[PDB]
Amino acid sequence: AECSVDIQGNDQMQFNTNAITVDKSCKQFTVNLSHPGNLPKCVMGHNWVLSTAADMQGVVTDGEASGLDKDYLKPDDSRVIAHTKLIGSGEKDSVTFDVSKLKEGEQYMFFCTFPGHSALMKGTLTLK
């Protein structure tokens, strides 16, 4: 029925949800990210990245190393299934991905690659 969901990353380094469920009927899925708080992109920026759980660490490691002008994401990274832009306070961004590529029942992981956030800003994403 509904293939979208609005998520938030506040100035406390946290997402307002830690688990997403994609409905079996959804052929594509949308996540609209927004940033409540007062802090700037260089201090408390967030993004939304999807990858398999096993790929997370690498994606972060290389992400952080990728630097800011790169939305803390290795450019052209094959491990990234989907991702938004790194956004600062008072901003928003959205991404819509191809569900047919997802493996039903596989618990994927989504998270922010901004330095030091992933440990606390991560969660599951499962296709029902």
Ligand SMILES: [Cu+2]
């Ligand atoms: Cu973050």
